[PDB]
Tab-separated table of C-alpha atoms in Angstrom:
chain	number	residue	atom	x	y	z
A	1	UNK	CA	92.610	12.967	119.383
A	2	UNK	CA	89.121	14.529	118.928
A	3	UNK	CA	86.213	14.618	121.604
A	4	UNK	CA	82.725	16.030	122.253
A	5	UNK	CA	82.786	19.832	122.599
A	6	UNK	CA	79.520	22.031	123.642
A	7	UNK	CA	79.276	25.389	120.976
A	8	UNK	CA	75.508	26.160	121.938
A	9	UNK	CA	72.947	24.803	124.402
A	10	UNK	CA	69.830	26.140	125.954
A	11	UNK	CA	68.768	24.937	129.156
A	12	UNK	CA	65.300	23.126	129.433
A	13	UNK	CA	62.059	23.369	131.557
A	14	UNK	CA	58.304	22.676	131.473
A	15	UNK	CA	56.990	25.326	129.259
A	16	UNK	CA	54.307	27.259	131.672
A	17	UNK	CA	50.539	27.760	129.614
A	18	UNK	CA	51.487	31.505	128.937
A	19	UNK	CA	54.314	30.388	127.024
A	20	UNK	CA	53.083	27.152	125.226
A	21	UNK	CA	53.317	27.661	121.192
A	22	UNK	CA	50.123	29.556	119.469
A	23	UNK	CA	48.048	27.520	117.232
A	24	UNK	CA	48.199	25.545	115.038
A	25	UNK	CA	50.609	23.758	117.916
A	26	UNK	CA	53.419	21.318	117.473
A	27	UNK	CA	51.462	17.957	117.294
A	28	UNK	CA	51.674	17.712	113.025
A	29	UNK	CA	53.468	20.794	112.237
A	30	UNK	CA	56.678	21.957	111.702
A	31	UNK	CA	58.694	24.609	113.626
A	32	UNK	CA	61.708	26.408	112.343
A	33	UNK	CA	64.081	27.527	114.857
A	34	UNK	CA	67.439	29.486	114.873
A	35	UNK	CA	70.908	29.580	117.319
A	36	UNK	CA	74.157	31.007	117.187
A	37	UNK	CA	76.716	28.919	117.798
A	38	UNK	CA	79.954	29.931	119.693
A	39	UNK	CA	83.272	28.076	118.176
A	40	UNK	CA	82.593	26.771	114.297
A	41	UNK	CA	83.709	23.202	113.504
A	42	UNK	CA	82.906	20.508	111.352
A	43	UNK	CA	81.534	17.377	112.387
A	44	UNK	CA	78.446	18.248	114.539
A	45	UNK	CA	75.837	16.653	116.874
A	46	UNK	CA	72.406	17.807	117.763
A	47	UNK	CA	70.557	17.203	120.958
A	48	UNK	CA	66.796	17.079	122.002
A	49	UNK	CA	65.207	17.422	125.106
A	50	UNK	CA	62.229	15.425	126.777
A	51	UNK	CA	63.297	16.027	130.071
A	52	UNK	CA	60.192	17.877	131.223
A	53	UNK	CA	57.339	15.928	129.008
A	54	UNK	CA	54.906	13.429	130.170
A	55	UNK	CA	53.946	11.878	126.928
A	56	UNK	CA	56.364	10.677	124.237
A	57	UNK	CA	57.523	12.893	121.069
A	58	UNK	CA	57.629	12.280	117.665
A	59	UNK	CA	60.235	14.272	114.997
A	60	UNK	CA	59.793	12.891	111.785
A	61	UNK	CA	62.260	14.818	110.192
A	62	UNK	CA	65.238	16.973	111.196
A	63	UNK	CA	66.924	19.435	108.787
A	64	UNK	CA	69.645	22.321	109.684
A	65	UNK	CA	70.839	25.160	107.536
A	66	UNK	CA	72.802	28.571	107.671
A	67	UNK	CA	69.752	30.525	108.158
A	68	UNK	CA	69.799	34.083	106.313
A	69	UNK	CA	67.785	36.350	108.715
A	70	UNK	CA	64.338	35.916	110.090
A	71	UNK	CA	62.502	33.012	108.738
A	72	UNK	CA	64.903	32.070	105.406
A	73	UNK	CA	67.846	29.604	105.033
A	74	UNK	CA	70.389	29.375	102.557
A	75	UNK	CA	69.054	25.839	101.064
A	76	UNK	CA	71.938	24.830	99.103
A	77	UNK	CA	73.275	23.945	102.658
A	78	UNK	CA	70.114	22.303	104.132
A	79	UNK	CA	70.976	18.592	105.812
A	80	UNK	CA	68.696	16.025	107.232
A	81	UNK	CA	69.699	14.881	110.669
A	82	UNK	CA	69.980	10.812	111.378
A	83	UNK	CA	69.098	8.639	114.466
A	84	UNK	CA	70.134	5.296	114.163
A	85	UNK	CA	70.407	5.548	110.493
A	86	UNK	CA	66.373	7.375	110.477
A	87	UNK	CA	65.085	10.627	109.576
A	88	UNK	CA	62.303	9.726	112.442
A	89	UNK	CA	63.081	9.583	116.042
A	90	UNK	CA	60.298	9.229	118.827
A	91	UNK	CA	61.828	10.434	122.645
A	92	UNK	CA	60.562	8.635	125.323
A	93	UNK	CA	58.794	10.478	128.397
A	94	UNK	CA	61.537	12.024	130.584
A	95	UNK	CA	64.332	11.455	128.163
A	96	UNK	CA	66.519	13.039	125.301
A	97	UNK	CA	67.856	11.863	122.096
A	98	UNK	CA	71.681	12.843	120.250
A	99	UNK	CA	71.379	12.772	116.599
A	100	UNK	CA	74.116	11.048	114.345
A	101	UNK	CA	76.976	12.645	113.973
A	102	UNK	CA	76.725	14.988	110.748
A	103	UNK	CA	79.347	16.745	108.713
A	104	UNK	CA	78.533	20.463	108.368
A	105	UNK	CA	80.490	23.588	107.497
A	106	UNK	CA	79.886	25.352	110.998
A	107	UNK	CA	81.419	28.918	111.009
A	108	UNK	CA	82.053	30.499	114.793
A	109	UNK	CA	78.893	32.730	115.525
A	110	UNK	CA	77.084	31.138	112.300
A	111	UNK	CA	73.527	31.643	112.746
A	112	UNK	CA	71.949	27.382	112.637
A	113	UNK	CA	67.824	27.034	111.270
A	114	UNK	CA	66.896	23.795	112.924
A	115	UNK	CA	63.533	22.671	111.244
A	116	UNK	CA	61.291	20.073	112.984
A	117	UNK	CA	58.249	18.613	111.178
A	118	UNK	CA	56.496	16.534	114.083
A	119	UNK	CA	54.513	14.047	114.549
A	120	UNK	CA	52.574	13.375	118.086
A	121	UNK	CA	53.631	15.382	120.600
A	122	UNK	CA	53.132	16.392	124.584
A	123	UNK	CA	50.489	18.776	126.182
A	124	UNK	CA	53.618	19.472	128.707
A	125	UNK	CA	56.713	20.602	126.656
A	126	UNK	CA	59.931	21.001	127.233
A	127	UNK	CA	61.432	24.010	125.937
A	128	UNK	CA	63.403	27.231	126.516
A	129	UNK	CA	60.587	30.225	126.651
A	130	UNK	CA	63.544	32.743	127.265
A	131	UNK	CA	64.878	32.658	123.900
A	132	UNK	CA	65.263	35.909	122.590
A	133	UNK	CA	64.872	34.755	119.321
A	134	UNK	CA	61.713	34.123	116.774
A	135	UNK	CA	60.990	30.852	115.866
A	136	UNK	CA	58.650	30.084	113.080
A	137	UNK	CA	55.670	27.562	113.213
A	138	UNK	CA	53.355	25.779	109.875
A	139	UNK	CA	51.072	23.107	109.919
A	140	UNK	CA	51.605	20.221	108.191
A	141	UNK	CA	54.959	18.349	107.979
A	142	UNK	CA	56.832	21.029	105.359
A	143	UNK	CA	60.828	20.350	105.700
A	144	UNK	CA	61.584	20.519	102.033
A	145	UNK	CA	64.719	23.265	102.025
A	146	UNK	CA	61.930	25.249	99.335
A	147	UNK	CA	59.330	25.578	102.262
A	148	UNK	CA	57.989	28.898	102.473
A	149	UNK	CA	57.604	30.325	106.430
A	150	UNK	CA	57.774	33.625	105.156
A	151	UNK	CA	53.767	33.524	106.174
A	152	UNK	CA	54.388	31.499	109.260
A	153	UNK	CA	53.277	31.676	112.747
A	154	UNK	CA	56.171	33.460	114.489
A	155	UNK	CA	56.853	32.691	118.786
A	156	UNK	CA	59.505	34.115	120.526
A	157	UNK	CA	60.190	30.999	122.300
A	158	UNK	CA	62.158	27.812	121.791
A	159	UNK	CA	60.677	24.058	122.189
A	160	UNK	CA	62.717	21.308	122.301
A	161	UNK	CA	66.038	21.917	121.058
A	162	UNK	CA	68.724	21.721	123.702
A	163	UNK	CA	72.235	21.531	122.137
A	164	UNK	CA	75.020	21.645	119.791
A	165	UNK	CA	78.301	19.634	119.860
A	166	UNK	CA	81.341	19.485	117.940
A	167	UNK	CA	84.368	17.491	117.389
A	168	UNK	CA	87.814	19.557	118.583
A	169	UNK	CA	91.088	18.595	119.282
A	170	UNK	CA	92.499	18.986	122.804
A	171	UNK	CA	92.886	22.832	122.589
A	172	UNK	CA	88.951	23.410	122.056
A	173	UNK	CA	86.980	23.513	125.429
A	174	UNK	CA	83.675	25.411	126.785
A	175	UNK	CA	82.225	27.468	129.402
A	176	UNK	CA	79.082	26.714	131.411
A	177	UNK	CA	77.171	29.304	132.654
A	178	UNK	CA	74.310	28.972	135.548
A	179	UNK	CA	72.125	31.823	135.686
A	180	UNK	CA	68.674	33.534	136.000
A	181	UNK	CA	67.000	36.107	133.419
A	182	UNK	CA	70.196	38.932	133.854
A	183	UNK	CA	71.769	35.762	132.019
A	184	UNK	CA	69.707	34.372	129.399
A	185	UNK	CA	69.019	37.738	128.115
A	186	UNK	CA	65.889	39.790	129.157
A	187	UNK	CA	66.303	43.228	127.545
A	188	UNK	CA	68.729	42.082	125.273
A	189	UNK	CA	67.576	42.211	121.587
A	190	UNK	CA	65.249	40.159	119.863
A	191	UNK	CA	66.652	37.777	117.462
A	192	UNK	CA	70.044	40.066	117.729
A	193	UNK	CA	71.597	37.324	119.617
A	194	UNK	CA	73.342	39.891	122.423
A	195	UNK	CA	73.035	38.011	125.337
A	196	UNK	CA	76.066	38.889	128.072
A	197	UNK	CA	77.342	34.901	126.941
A	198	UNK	CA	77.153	36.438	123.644
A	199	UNK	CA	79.382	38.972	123.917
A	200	UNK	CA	81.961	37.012	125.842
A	201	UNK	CA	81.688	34.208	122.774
A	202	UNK	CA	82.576	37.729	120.690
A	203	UNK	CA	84.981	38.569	122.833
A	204	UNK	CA	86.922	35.316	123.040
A	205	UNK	CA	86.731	34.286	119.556
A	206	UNK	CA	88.423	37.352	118.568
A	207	UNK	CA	91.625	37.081	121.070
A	208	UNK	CA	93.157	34.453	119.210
A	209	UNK	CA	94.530	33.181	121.941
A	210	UNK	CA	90.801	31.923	123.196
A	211	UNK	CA	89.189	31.343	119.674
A	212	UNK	CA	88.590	27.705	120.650
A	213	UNK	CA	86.751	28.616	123.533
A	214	UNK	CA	83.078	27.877	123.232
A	215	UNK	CA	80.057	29.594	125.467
A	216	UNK	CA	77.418	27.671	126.519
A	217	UNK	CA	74.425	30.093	128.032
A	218	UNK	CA	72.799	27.682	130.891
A	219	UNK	CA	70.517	30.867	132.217
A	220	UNK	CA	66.531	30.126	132.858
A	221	UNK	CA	64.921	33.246	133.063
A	222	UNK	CA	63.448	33.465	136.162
A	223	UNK	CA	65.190	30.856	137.918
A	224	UNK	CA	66.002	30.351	141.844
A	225	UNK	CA	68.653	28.691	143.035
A	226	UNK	CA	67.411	26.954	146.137
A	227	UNK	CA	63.485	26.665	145.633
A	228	UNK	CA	60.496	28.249	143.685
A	229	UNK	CA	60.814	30.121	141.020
A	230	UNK	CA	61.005	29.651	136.930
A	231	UNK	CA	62.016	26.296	135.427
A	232	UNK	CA	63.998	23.933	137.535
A	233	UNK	CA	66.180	25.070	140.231
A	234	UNK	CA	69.687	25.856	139.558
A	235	UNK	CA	70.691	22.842	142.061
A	236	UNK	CA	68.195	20.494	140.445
A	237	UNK	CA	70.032	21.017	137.555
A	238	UNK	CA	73.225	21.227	138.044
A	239	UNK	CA	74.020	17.743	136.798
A	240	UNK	CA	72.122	18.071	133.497
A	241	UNK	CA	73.056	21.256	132.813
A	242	UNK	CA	76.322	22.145	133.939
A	243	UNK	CA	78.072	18.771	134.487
A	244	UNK	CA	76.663	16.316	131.789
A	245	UNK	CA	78.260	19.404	129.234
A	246	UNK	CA	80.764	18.328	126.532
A	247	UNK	CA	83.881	19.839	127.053
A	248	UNK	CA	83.701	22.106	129.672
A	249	UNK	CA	86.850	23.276	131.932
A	250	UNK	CA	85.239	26.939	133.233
A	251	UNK	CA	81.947	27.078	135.184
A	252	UNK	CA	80.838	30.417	135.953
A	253	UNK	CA	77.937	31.058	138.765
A	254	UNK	CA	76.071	34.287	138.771
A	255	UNK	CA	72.336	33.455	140.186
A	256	UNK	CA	70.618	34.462	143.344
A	257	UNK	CA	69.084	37.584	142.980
A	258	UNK	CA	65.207	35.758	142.558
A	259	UNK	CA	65.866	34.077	145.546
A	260	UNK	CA	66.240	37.122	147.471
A	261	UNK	CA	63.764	39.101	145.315
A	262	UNK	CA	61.218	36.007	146.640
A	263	UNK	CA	61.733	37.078	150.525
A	264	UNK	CA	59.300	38.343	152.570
A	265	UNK	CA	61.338	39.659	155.399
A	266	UNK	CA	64.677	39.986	156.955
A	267	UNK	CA	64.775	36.433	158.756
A	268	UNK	CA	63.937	35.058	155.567
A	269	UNK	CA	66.109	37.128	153.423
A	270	UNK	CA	68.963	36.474	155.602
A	271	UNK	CA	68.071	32.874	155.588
A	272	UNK	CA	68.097	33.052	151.344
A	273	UNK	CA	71.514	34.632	152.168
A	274	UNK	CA	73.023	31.720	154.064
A	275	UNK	CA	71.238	29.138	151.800
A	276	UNK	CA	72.974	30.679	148.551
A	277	UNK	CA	76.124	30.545	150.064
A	278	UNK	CA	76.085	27.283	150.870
A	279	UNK	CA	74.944	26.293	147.456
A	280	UNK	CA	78.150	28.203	145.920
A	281	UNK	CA	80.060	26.099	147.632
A	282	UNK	CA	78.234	22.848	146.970
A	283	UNK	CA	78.430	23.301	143.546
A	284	UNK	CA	82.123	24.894	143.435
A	285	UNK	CA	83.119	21.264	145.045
A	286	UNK	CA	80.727	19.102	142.878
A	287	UNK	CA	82.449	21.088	139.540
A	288	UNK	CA	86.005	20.518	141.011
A	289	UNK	CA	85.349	16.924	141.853
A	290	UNK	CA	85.143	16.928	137.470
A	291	UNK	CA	88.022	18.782	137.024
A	292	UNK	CA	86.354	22.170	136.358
A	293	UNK	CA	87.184	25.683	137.530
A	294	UNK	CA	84.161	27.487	139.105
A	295	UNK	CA	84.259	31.919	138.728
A	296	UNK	CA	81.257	33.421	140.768
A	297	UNK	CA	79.409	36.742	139.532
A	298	UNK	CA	78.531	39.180	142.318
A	299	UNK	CA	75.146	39.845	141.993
A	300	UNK	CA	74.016	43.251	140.909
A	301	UNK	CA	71.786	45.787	141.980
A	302	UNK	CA	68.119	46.005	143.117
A	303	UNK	CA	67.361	49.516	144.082
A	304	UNK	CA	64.906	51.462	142.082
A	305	UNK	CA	63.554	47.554	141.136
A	306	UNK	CA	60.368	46.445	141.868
A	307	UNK	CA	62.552	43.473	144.173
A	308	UNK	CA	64.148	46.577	146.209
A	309	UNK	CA	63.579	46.259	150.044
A	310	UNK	CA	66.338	47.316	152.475
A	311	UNK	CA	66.786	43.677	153.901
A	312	UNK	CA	67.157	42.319	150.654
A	313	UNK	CA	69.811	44.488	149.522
A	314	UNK	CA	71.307	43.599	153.369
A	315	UNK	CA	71.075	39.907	151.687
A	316	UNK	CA	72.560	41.169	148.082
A	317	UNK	CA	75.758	42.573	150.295
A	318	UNK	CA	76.257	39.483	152.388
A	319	UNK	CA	75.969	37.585	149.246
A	320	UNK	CA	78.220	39.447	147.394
A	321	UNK	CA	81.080	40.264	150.309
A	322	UNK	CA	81.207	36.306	150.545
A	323	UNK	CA	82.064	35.664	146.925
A	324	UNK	CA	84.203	38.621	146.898
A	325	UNK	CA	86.316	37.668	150.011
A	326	UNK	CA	85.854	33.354	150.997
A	327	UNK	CA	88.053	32.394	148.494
A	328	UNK	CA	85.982	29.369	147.518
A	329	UNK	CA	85.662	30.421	144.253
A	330	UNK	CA	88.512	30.698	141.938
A	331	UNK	CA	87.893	33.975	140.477
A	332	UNK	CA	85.566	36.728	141.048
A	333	UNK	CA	83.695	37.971	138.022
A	334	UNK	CA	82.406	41.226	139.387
A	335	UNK	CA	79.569	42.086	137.370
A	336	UNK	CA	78.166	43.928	140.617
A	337	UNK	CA	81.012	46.710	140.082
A	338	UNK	CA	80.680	46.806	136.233
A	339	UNK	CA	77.257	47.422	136.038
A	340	UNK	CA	76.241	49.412	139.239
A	341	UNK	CA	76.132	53.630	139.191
A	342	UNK	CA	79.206	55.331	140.075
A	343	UNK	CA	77.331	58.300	141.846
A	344	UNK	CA	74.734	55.849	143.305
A	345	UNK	CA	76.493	52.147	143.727
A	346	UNK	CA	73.267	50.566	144.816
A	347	UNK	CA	71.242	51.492	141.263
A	348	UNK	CA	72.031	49.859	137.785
A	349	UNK	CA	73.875	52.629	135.637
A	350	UNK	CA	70.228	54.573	133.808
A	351	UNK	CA	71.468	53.992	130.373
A	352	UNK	CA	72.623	50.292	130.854
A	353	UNK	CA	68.926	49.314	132.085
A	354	UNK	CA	66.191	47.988	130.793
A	355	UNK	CA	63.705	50.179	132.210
A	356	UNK	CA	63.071	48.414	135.142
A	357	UNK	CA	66.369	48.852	137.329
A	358	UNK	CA	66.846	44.889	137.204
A	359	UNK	CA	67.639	43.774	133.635
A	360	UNK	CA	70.268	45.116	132.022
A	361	UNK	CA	70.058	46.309	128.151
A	362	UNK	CA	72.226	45.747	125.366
A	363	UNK	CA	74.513	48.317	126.537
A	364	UNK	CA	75.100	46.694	129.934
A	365	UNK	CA	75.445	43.136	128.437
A	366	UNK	CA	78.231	44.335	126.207
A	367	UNK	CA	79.624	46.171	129.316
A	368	UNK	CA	79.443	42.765	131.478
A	369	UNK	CA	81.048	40.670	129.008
A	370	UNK	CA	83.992	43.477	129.119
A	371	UNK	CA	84.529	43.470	132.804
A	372	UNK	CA	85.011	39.543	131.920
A	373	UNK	CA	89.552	38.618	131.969
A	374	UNK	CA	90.115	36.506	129.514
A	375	UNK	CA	93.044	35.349	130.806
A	376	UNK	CA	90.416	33.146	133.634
A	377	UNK	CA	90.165	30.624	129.946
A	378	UNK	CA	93.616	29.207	129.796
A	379	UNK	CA	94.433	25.809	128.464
């Protein structure tokens, strides 16, 4: 009567040299890391990702805890993760590993220290640099719950870490979302957790109608769709990241816009154009072969952006009149009309931006995440 359900994940990728962790490194030290889950629940799983590692990778030890802010957890709740029975897991080249199953007291939106004391570990690391969130690094292997970090090396990054399930009843389900930066959060705050999948999470898990919806936030920052780009494209990982989810019923596209931004001229842009199209619709068929419903975001605007050129925003528009009008997808999530200028509907709105005319702020997050129905999350 219970199953698998996703309530966090972050989506994995070989971390590039400018993002790698600052000394004293992971090999022999331990890193303390913090999520926020979506929908709370009781008996948990944890998963760990070696997708994009060359070299095998030691954890001896594996604690959680409801962290307090910053670098301190409450330690009266601190638990040591199992695999197979052992504190110590080693993930082979290429591969991940799913803790034990673990009872913990997981509250919707609670705030989750996961603290890794290593032991060998990879030159090439898989990780999420994206994160939006501090993590905390020490030498040595120090995953007592008493460990002082309040000293340690901070990196706005995440390494590693690549999930958290839960066991729900038939009601509970998730949304997976595939996107680029605009999705995993550039220009939202720093460990304020205010991502535009944040705010729908919010959102949902105050209509009490959707409270046992989870959100989980698939978005690489600077990732392509069909080639180049940041991290792994979006239809290299589809399966992984979208499919091979626990739980999931909604998919919801909104990508593209690095493609275009990569384009050189109008053959190619147009090109780009065609290409993303027809990878909507590959992937709207591959998610309803599995039974899941697939919204696509319009993509929003370029102008003023160091991307802007006249035949890529000639792309954008056949982009975005072909999600708005095919009918492949099943909804239309039109983030391109909640977050573009109403006296200049090519241009972010000024005080929803970044800075840079491309990246929304915390503002236009919270304002995306509105424009979202809730009634699209039915069970």
């Amino acid at each position: 009567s219970k199953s698998w359900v996703g309530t966090w994940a972050t989506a994995p990728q070989l971390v590039e040299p400018r993002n790698m962790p600052p000394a004293p490194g992971l090999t022999n030290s331990t890193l303390r890391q913090v999520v926020c889950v979506s929908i709370g629940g009781k008996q948990l799983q944890f998963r760990f990702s070696n997708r994009f590692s060359k070299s095998p990778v030691t954890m001896k030890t594996v604690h959680i805890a409801v962290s307090k802010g910053g670098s301190e957890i409450e330690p009266s709740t601190s638990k040591e993760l199992t695999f197979n029975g052992q504190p110590d897991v080693t993930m082979e080249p290429g591969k991940a590993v799913i803790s034990d199953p673990i009872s913990f007291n997981l509250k919707p939106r609670m705030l989750v220290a996961i603290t890794i004391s290593f032991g060998e570990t990879s030159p090439d690391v898989t990780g999420h640099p994206g994160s939006r969130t501090t993590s905390y690094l020490l030498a040595g292997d120090q995953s007592s719950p008493d460990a002082d970090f309040s000293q340690a090396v901070k990196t706005d990054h995440w390494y590693v870490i690549n999930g958290i399930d839960l066991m729900a009843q038939k009601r509970a389900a998730a949304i997976a979302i595939l996107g680029n930066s605009i999705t995993d959060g550039r220009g939202s705050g720093t460990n304020k957790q205010d991502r535009w999948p944040d705010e729908l999470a919010l959102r949902l898990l105050k209509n009490k109608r959707t409270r046992d919806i989870g959100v989980l936030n698939m978005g690489i920052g600077g990732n392509c769709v069909l080639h180049g780009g940041l991290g792994p494209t979006a239809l290299s990982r589809f399966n992984r990241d979208i499919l091979k989810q626990h739980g999931v019923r909604w998919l919801i596209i909104f990508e593209g816009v690095n493609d275009i931004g990569g384009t050189p001229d109008k053959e190619a842009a147009d090109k780009v154009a065609q290409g993303l199209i027809a990878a909507y619709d590959k992937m709207i068929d591959e998610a309803h072969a599995k039974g899941i419903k697939v919204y696509g975001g319009t993509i929003t605007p370029i102008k003023k952006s160091f991307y802007y050129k006249d035949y890529r925003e000639t792309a954008r528009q056949t982009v975005n009149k072909w999600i708005r009008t095919s009918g492949h997808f099943d909804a239309v999530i039109d983030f391109d009309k909640a977050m573009r200028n109403p006296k200049d509907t090519l241009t972010l709105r000024p005080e929803a931006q970044s800075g840079d005319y491309l990246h929304p702020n915390e503002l236009g997050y919270r304002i995306m995440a509105g424009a979202i129905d809730l009634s699209l999350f039915k069970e």
